[PDB]
Every structure is written in C-alpha cells, then in structure tokens.
Amino acid sequence: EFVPPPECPVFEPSWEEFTDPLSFIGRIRPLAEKTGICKIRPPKDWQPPFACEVKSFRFTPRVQRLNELEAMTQAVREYTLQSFGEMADNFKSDYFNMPVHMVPTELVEKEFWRLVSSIEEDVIVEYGADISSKDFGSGFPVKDGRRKILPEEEEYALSGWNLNNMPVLEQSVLAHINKVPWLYVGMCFSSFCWHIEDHWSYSINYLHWGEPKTWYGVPSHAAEQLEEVMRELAPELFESQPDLLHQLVTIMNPNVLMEHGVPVYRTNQCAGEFVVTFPRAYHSGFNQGYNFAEAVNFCT
Numbered sequence: 001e002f003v004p005p006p007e008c009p010v011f012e013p014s015w016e017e018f019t020d021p022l023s024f025i026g027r028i029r030p031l032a033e034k035t036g037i038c039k040i041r042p043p044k045d046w047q048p049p050f051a052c053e054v055k056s057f058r059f060t061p062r063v064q065r066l067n068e069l070e071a072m073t074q075a076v077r078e079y080t081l082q083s084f085g086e087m088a089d090n091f092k093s094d095y096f097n098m099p100v101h102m103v104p105t106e107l108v109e110k111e112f113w114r115l116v117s118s119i120e121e122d123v124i125v126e127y128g129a130d131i132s133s134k135d136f137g138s139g140f141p142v143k144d145g146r147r148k149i150l151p152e153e154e155e156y157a158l159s160g161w162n163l164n165n166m167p168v169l170e171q172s173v174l175a176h177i178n179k180v181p182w183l184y185v186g187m188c189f190s191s192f193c194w195h196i197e198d199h200w201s202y203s204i205n206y207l208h209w210g211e212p213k214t215w216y217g218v219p220s221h222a223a224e225q226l227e228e229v230m231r232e233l234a235p236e237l238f239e240s241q242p243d244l245l246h247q248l249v250t251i252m253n254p255n256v257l258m259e260h261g262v263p264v265y266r267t268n269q270c271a272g273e274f275v276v277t278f279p280r281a282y283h284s285g286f287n288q289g290y291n292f293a294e295a296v297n298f299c300t
C-alpha cells in the first residue's frame with residue numbers, strides 16, 4: 001500500500017516574525033526551498049472572519065474521474081455552499097461507513113491512491129475549483145466597500161497575510177512600455193495534479209475552513225528529474241504535449257516518483273494554516289473532505 005512521503009517543514013512564527021510575509025518567507029527559504037512546499041501556522045490569536053457572500057454563493061463544480069488515466073489502457077450540476085457541503089459529507093460518510101471527522105487522514109490518502117490506479121472501481125467526485133474571488137468576494141475581508149467590515153475585522157483587511165494584499169506584479173520592461181485570489185471548494189478525493197506555476201511563480205494558499213487539504217511537493221532542484229520520470233511513464237499519447245496541456249493530466253503516485261529518486265514531501269494543511277510553494281516546486285494534492293481554500297501567485 002501507499003507509503004507516506006516525509007513531512008515538509010511547518011513553521012509557527014511568533015508575532016514578531018509574523019509582521020511581514022515576504023520577509024518571513026525570505027528567511028525560511030534556505031530550508032523551505034529544499035522541500036518545495038512548507039506550511040505556516042499563524043499565531044493562535046490570528047483568526048480572520050470568513051467574508052464571502054454565502055447567501056448568493058453558487059457554482060457548478062467540475063467532474064473528476066479518479067482513474068481516468070488508468071482507464072485509457074455526468075453533467076455539471078449547480079450547488080450552493082450548503083448543498084455542496086451536504087453532498088460532500090454524505091459522500092464521504094457513505095464511502096467509509098463512518099462519521100466524516102472520524103476517518104483517519106492516512107486512510108483517505110491510502111484510498112485515494114488506490115482509486116487513482118484501480119480499474120475495477122470507478123469513483124467520480126466534484127471539485128469547485130478556480131472560482132474567482134471577484135464573483136462572490138474573497139474569503140478574507142477587503143476594504144472595497146462591497147461588504148461590511150466590523151472594527152475588529154479591519155486588521156485582517158489590512159494584514160499582509162490577507163491574500164488580497166500580496167504583491168502580484170512581476171518586474172519587466174513591458175510593464176513600463178504598457179490578478180486576484182482564486183477559491184477552491186473541496187470534497188473528499190477532489191484533487192489537483194502535478195504542476196508548477198506560470199512564470200515559475202511562488203504561490204500562497206490558505207485553508208479558510210473545513211477538513212484538511214493534503215499536499216505533495218518536490219523541490220525545484222529536482223524539477224527536471226520529475227519531468228523526466230513523467231516523460232518515461234506518462235501515456236505516450238500525451239507525451240508530446242506542451243507542458244501547459246500535459247499538466248492537466250499529470251497524475252502520478254508520489255511513491256513512483258520516490259522510487260525513481262525524486263524527493264517528495266507531504267503535509268496535511270488544516271483550517272487556518274498557510275501553504276507556500278516555492279518557484280518551480282512541483283506540487284499536487286487532494287482534499288480530505290468538505291473545505292474552502294483561497295490561493296494566489298505572488299512575486300518577490
């Protein structure tokens with residue numbers, strides 16, 4: 001069965017270290033760049049409110065067939081946050097015959113990877129992925145006037161760890177001659193396959209609420225090693241595809257990469273925790289259950 005990769009670094013900055021995100025990320029870089037991904041737990045008393053327009057939040061999530069690649073050899077339906085959560089919890093509790101909170105993270109992980117390569121069982125899930133923060137607002141409070149902000153929430157609207165306040169403009173000559181966070185509503189086994197960011201950007205990811213998001217990361221020094229294993233083992237029909245298209249179907253069990261000598265690290269990102277991905281650090285992951293994440297690419 002699946003062997004969990006080693007854990008990536010977790011940082012628990014003090015209030016002093018927590019003052020500036022770019023400064024803190026710059027300081028942890030000698031360790032974190034060697035693991036590709038890292039997790040950051042804010043101080044216990046840092047608790048932003050959840051600020052999306054819940055009454056009107058509606059979406060049609062994409063359908064994900066876990067074993068679609070293995071198989072080489074359902075209409076979109078609309079939910080609210082509440083109705084998606086009812087569906088997601090019923091799915092997971094039915095699947096494991098247990099209350100959702102009682103399912104060990106290790107068992108979801110082992111079952112996910114078994115299903116990805118199974119030919120006898122076809123499991124299909126749904127992912128509310130790539131929902132713009134413009135549609136119903138960010139999960140963080142923002143001082144744009146669309147939604148009321150209480151006085152005790154203003155510090156979160158102004159915080160450098162609010163994803164809407166991260167720097168996003170890349171330096172370039174074209175910038176002289178001449179982006180908002182995205183949201184992800186997860187359910188058990190919804191997933192994202194191996195990729196890096198456009199422009200080799202950093203990314204930062206915050207889990208507002210719900211069950212954990214499980215991540216795998218590869219440090220940038222091993223990016224070419226990973227791409228070589230993909231070439232060798234990915235289906236030939238997709239082998240000639242440009243990376244921007246191949247990344248839509250680059251699903252690969254971390255143990256396969258590990259057997260080929262690619263360093264892989266894992267983490268369970270829990271509610272209230274951040275994950276940072278370093279430049280050119282391949283990453284992939286899946287959701288343990290019903291949850292809500294926000295992510296943005298930022299530059300240093």
Ligand SMILES: O=C(Cc1ccc(Cl)cc1)Nc1cnccc1C(=O)O
Pocket residue numbers: 129130184191192193205213248249285293295
């Ligand atoms: O990219 C996606 C969404 C997605 C896009 C296309 C397909 Cl085919 C599947 C999934 N998500 C992520 C990308 N990076 C970090 C984290 C995530 C996340 O889901 O938490």
Ligand SMILES: [Mn+2]
Pocket residue numbers: 195196197203283
């Ligand atoms: Mn990404």
